[PDB]
Design a protein around this ligand. Structure first.
Ligand SMILES: CO[C@@H]1O[C@H](CO)[C@@H](O)[C@H](O)[C@H]1S[C@@H]1O[C@H](CO)[C@@H](O)[C@H](O)[C@H]1O
Ligand SMILES: CC(=O)N[C@@H]1[C@@H](O)[C@H](O)[C@@H](CO)O[C@H]1O
Length: 606
């Protein structure tokens, strides 16, 4: 169509499939393998990106241009990488990915939304869609086009260090929360074919349904371990939400470190090619997890030639290397040159990668939009996170006896009140993992409102608010307090570091609740990624709230505590009596919960 130097793949008016085929047909082997290679920004330079025709970059947890970097600093970094990629012979733009799993959470000043388990407690898929929409904007504020979300694991054992990244042990709730996808990506057209990738344009991001499949079913909640279950169970529990993701046009799927009945997912041709691609008709691209192909072998990385062969033959399209790109490209190149991996497999991988890039508009808008920078931490997004935090809270107790006056909602006007506990004034603890760093961190790590700051912002001006992190019983008894709010719970974690067989919160936690509640009526706010041993905390407390990991907007907690809104959250997980019961999920033959899935007391707004 027209000009003398006309190149069909560069024509924005052409059908995506025609552009894919036109570009694919021009590519060298090095250009093709390049597209299949994703590298860490930490090993990227302009020459590396050009010389190896690199297809993608990512930031791993905490991989940031610097501490406290502005949105514009992120845009300038991503654009610098993109300029190198656009300078190659074919000018194929890279796609930049990041774990934006509860907001754009690596980024200083990004809105931090509640983690997925709390979102499950809301039973509000439209809320989650809106969170997807806000997250896409904050990711694009930083120049990034791809989010490694949603985690649609169905966590079947809360001893797993990623249980907080699962919306529920009930696959029906997880399925419902796949609305994150059209939030992040845009709603698909009316005519849409299930399994096709979709992103609306430059103000949306590619999403990633992860981790395929059965990541939430591992033995004893051991991260990256074995999921031992028959096909009927895999398909009944762990698979369904992937079909919902296909119906909603999820652009990518990431493979799990875990195994299914002893077969590494990263090597499972039957499930990746036979099921995901050939049965669900997935037409986006399949990405590895971080050194996921390395971990096919024991020890990991001990036969990388086999790792490349097994993963690429299984049907993976893009490999999150993420560091040793030279070894990966060299080995894959050798496998193709030796006929071990057919060109048909390379061409399929590249077809899918290009399909996503063309579909999302990346060839038309390869660079960041500086006008989007102000989306980062934008107050409307924080108001949304605040709504979400509030809706996530599950009221487990509100009065020690049925004769007692309900403690909650608390009055905003009282002469003097106490705020206490390790988690009352700690923004990092209330955000949990995947906040600034992978494992999270302690203290004021980003912009937000702690529980203490939220209480001070909510109460009548005549109300004196005292903070004591770990007061003794005498301090409380002598203080003249009307009531106390005491916040305790889990420290931030992710992945294997969070695997935990005991599920008891660290001390001082219980001792502080006991000291405070022994002296004055108390509302205990439990900050956790999962159910934890709770009977001792309940016994001490007048009221107790499961607040999960509510994120940067602590005023979501006080909105409910002080009756601006009624409590509405319902447990999205079984609360066990003892870890000896685990695994124990709703619908099990022997089901003896402390609180069943769906439990939640309510209050009315005052
Ligand atoms: C950021 O990657 C994590 O960090 C540690 C240390 O660098 C690695 O050893 C972990 O295996 C990965 S876990 C993996 O990270 C992906 C990219 O960040 C993420 O999308 C996925 O959900 C994780 O399983
Ligand atoms: C399939 C799989 O990952 N199995 C692992 C096994 O290799 C390891 O010995 C153990 C660690 O305790 O956890 C389990």
């Amino acid at each position: 169509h027209h000009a003398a130097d006309y190149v069909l793949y560069k024509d924005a008016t052409k059908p995506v499939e025609d552009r894919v085929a036109d570009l694919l047909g021009r590519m060298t082997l090095a250009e093709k393998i390049g597209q299949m290679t994703q590298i860490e920004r930490l090993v990227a330079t302009p020459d590396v990106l050009r010389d190896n025709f690199i297809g993608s970059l990512l930031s791993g947890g905490g991989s940031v241009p610097r501490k406290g970097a502005t949105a514009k600093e992120w845009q300038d970094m991503v654009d610098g990488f993109q300029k190198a990629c656009m300078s190659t012979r074919l000018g194929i733009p890279m796609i930049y990915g990041i774990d934006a799993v509860h907001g754009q959470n690596n980024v200083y000043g990004a809105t931090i939304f509640p983690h997925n388990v709390g979102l499950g407690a809301t039973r509000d898929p439209y809320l989650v869609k809106r969170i997807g929409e806000a997250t896409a904007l904050e990711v694009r504020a930083t120049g990034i086009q791809y989010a490694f979300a949603p985690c649609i694991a169905v966590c079947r054992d809360p001893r797993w260090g990623r249980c907080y990244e699962s919306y529920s042990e009930d696959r029906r709730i997880v399925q419902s929360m796949t609305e994150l996808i059209p939030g992040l990506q845009g709603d698909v057209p009316k005519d849409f074919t299930s399994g096709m990738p979709f992103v609306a344009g430059k103000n949306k991001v590619a999403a990633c349904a992860k981790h395929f499949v059965g990541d939430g079913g591992t033995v004893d909640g051991i991260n990256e371990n074995n999921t031992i279950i028959n096909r009927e169970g895999l398909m009944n529990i762990h698979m369904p939400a992937y079909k919902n993701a296909m119906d909603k046009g999820v652009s990518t799927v990431m493979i799990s470190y875990s195994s299914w009945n002893g077969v590494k997912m990263h090597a499972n041709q039957d499930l990746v090619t036979g099921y995901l691609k050939d049965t669900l008709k997935f037409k986006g691209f399949v990405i590895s997890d971080w050194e996921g192909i390395d971990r096919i072998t024991t020890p990991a990385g001990s036969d990388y030639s086999y790792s490349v062969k097994a993963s690429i033959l299984a049907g993976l399209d893009m490999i999150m290397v993420p560091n040793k790109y030279q070894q990966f490209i060299s080995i894959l190149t050798g496998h193709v040159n030796g006929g071990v991996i057919p060109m048909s497999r390379i061409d399929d991988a590249v077809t899918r990668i290009l399909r996503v890039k063309f579909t999302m508009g990346l060839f038309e808008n390869p660079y960041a939009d500086p006008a989007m920078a102000e989306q980062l931490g934008k107050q409307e997004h924080r108001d949304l996170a605040r709504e979400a935090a509030r809706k996530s809270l599950v009221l487990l107790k509100n009065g020690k006896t049925s004769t007692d006056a309900p403690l909650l909602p608390l009055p905003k006007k009282a002469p003097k009140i106490l705020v206490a506990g390790s988690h009352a004034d700690n923004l990092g603890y209330q955000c949990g993992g995947w906040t600034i760093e992978a494992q999270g961190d302690t203290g004021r790590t980003t912009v937000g409102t702690t529980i203490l700051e939220a209480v001070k912002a909510a109460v009548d001006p005549s109300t004196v608010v005292v903070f004591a992190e770990n007061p003794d019983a005498e301090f409380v008894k002598s203080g003249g307090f009307s009531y106390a709010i005491v916040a305790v719970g889990e420290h931030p974690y992710t992945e294997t570091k969070g695997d935990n067989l005991n599920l008891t919160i660290p001390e001082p936690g219980l001792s502080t609740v006991q000291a405070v509640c022994g002296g004055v009526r108390c509302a205990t706010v439990l900050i956790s990624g999962r159910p934890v041993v709770v009977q001792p905390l309940l016994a001490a407390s007048d009221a107790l709230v499961a607040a999960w990991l509510p994120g940067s907007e602590g005023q979501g907690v006080t909105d409910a505590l002080f009756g601006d809104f009624g409590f509405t959250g319902r447990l999205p997980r079984t609360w066990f009596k003892s870890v000896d019961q685990l695994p124990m999920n709703v619908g099990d033959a022997h089901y003896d919960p402390l609180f069943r899935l769906g439990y939640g007391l309510t209050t009315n707004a005052t």
